[PDB]
Design a protein around this ligand. Structure first.
Ligand SMILES: CCCC[C@@H](F)CCCC[C@H](C)Cc1cc(O)c([C@@H](CCCC)CCCC[C@H](C)Cc2cc(O)cc(O)c2)c(O)c1
Ligand SMILES: [Ca+2]
Ligand SMILES: [Ca+2]
Ligand SMILES: [Ca+2]
Ligand SMILES: [Ca+2]
Ligand SMILES: [Ca+2]
Ligand SMILES: [Ca+2]
Ligand SMILES: [Ca+2]
Ligand SMILES: [Ca+2]
Ligand SMILES: [Ca+2]
Ligand SMILES: [Ca+2]
Ligand SMILES: [Ca+2]
Ligand SMILES: [Ca+2]
Ligand SMILES: [Cl-]
Ligand SMILES: [Cl-]
Ligand SMILES: [Cl-]
Ligand SMILES: [Cl-]
Ligand SMILES: [Cl-]
Ligand SMILES: [Cl-]
Ligand SMILES: [Cl-]
Ligand SMILES: [Mg+2]
Ligand SMILES: [Mg+2]
Ligand SMILES: [Mg+2]
Ligand SMILES: [Mg+2]
Ligand SMILES: [Mg+2]
Length: 653
């Protein structure tokens, strides 16, 4: 019976949210939701007002740590939730700009009996907090997809004698004119109830009801509305049986790839399941080796009871170096506080040689790694602390400036000894999305900034620009460059060619290398070793086109390969939702080919690696059945392409 559902839902959500979320975070959230005009969730947080310790050096009190522990803050891009992990009872999942595919509940995780509330914000963009109107994106919003179930099962589903209040989504900014709520089954499986908070979505069967989600501030919806997408009960039909399929019942992601000197191909990423080994807890890091004929030689899985991923990998020709972040304590290491970065070394036989966990009392992230021809290793990332030197935003002064990251680069020898760490940026946000060594002892880094790092930012409201830094063999800066439009421009990855010139790829909402075709467009920029911008190419469709994650590689012939996602007809007719794409360019930016592939469901490439004089590998993630039947939520895939024309080959030969 749905009698008194309103009262029961409010008391359940209030009790769980107020029991789980720290008082500092409750105080912060209450302030934000009231200021923003999304106040429905506020009365659910009843902890006392508490001083927010934005700059505490105690890892347990440091507010960036607290906020990060209970949130997935996504990017200005159209994001899948690439950071989701079953490590907390309550999570705030914040899509920000772009058309986000928002998930927080892993249907393959053992969550029986666990309290689970995912609080979703599809947009709630940064511009809402602008004291001054007129910013280019003020008042803009995007179609976000809130994933509350799929072909396999409803999410947040306890399937018991209660109303199923212990697990539920709470979507705070659902706009039925733009957004979509994705549900398992069909409309006859649900009942909507108007409640004080908005709308309750109940799964309904003969034996009773189970609360799947609450939509704050919206009432009088219809399950016949096109803003509900029902997924039935049957896994998607398989396409691209030529691909290598990697998947478990849980969320599985390839985030990076590399090749060794013998042509063996490696992939890796994160998994909520038991992919390379038995799951240790929440998301673990994993990697796998394939021979050049496509046979898997081994898979390995590592981490902690907390959350970690492999975000980058590279080879010295034999060994495989891997980099990412962790929320826990890795083997043979000590935590530095909050989230930390790590570098690890695997030999060609899959033996873990060592792991080095590094960081400060506050949050580090690290998505990038490169290995030079001498065998030294560079990682890069961002830090809220003072890792390579004092953070540009050290403490709170008379003018408050929100705690913010600087970029860093760290150099290591083959035994994992740290040779130096460099840190740089502005008082505001500076993130890292690239690292690449040249042949002459230098290393480049790149990323995004809200500030004026290498040049005056032409945005009027702190919109992102791209930046590049050249460091010498000792970690000293030789130059800093910055480029962009007045709108958001976002870098994903960088790489050098055989001459030592530096290339970067990303997306733009403006006219960076030419007239924007619509929405997000792709760019490729080239700088010489002396910091001169040589050219920027921009291309796309009228729809949303972007590289993603490990989006560039350069082969021994100085051909450039890019990869990412598009919801347009970029390389061909779109199969449905976002598809993957890849492209090849020469060193002067002439585009040699452009291909698109995927399933009728959401796909994105995440990594591209070219074998010198061999095959091209494009790998990524999907909600569809790519290679074989989807085993649960996100699965991953690798495609072997002919590098001359982008045509897909059978993975196994
Ligand atoms: C209920 C909804 C809450 C929504 C909102 F309340 C959350 C504020 C959390 C703030 C937290 C204490 C710390 C933090 C800061 C940070 O920058 C980032 C970056 C990631 C870059 C570093 C890896 C992405 C998110 C930027 C969003 C800014 C609003 C943009 C900004 C930055 C800035 O430096 C100055 C500004 O004025 C505005 C975090 O992920 C977490
Ligand atoms: Ca986004
Ligand atoms: Ca969004
Ligand atoms: Ca939206
Ligand atoms: Ca439920
Ligand atoms: Ca783990
Ligand atoms: Ca840390
Ligand atoms: Ca900074
Ligand atoms: Ca810009
Ligand atoms: Ca476009
Ligand atoms: Ca790369
Ligand atoms: Ca697709
Ligand atoms: Ca899966
Ligand atoms: Cl971002
Ligand atoms: Cl706004
Ligand atoms: Cl109940
Ligand atoms: Cl209805
Ligand atoms: Cl099939
Ligand atoms: Cl082997
Ligand atoms: Cl600045
Ligand atoms: Mg029930
Ligand atoms: Mg296979
Ligand atoms: Mg097989
Ligand atoms: Mg201004
Ligand atoms: Mg390479």
């Amino acid at each position: 019976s749905l009698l008194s559902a309103d009262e029961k839902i409010t008391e359940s959500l209030r009790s769980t949210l107020s029991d789980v979320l720290p008082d500092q975070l409750q105080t912060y959230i209450r302030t934000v939701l009231q200021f923003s005009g999304r106040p429905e969730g506020a009365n659910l947080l009843t902890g006392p007002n508490t001083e927010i310790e934005f700059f505490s050096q105690d890892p347990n009190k440091n507010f960036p740590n607290i906020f990060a522990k209970y949130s997935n803050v996504l990017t200005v891009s159209s994001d899948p939730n690439f950071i989701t992990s079953e490590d907390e009872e309550v999570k705030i999942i914040w899509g920000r700009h772009g058309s986000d595919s928002l998930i927080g509940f892993d249907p393959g995780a053992d969550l029986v009996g666990k309290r689970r509330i995912d609080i979703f914000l599809g947009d709630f963009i940064d511009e809402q907090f602008n004291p001054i109107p007129g910013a280019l994106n003020a008042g803009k919003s995007w179609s976000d997809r809130f994933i509350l179930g799929d072909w396999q099962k409803p999410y947040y589903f306890e399937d018991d004698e209660t109303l199923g209040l212990n697990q539920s989504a709470m979507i705070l900014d659902f706009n039925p004119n733009e957004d979509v709520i994705q549900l398992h089954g069909d409309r006859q499986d649900y009942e909507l109830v108007n409640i004080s908070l908005g709308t309750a979505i109940f799964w309904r069967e003969k034996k009773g009801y189970d609360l799947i989600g609450v939509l704050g501030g919206v009432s009088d919806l219809s399950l016949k509305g096109d803003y509900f997408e029902f997924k039935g009960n049957t896994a998607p039909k398989t396409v691209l049986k030529t691909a290598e399929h990697i998947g478990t019942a849980a969320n599985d992601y390839i985030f990076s790839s590399t090749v060794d000197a013998k042509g063996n191909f490696y992939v890796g990423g994160g998994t909520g399941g038991s992919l390379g080994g038995r799951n240790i807890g929440a998301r673990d890091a994993w990697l796998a080796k394939y021979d050049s004929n496509g046979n898997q030689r081994w898979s390995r899985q590592f981490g902690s009871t907390g959350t970690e991923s492999l975000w980058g990998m590279a080879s010295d020709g034999s060994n495989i170096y891997v980099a990412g972040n962790t929320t826990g304590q890795l083997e043979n290491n000590t935590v530095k506080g909050g989230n930390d970065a790590y570098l690890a070394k695997y030999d060609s036989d899959g033996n873990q040689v060592w792991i080095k966990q590094n960081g400060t009392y506050t949050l580090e992230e690290s998505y990038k790694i490169t290995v030079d021809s001498s065998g030294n290793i560079y990682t890069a990332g961002a830090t809220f602390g003072s890792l390579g030197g004092p953070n540009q935003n050290l403490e709170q002064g008379e003018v408050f400036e929100l705690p913010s990251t600087d970029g860093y680069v760290a150099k290591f020898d083959s035994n994992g000894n740290q040779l130096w760490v460099a840190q740089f940026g502005t008082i505001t946000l500076d993130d890292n999305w690239g690292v690449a060594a040249d042949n002459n002892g230098n290393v480049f880094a790149g990323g995004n900034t809200k500030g004026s790092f290498g040049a005056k930012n032409t945005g009027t409201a702190g919109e992102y620009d791209a930046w590049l830094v050249k460091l010498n063999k000792d970690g000293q800066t030789d130059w800093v460059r910055q480029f962009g439009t007045p709108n958001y421009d976002f870098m994903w990855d960088i790489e050098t060619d055989s001459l030592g010139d530096i290339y970067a790829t990303g997306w733009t909402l403006g006219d960076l290398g030419g007239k924007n075709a619509g929405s997000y467009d792709v760019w490729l920029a080239k700088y010489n070793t002396n910091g001169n911008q040589l050219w920027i190419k921009q291309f796309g469709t009228s729809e949303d086109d972007a590289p993603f994650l490990d989006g560039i590689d350069i082969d021994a012939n100085d051909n450039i390969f890019l990869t990412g996602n598009t919801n347009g007809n970029l390389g061909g007719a779109n199969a449905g939702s976002y598809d993957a794409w890849a492209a090849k360019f020469d060193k002067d930016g002439n585009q040699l080919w452009l291909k698109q592939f995927g399933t009728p469901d959401y796909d994105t490439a995440t990594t591209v690696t070219a074998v010198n004089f061999g095959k091209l590998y494009v790998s990524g993630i999907t909600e569809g059945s790519l290679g074989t039947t989807n085993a649960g939520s996100y699965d991953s895939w690798a495609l072997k392409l002919d590098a001359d024309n982008g045509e897909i080959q059978d993975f196994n030969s």
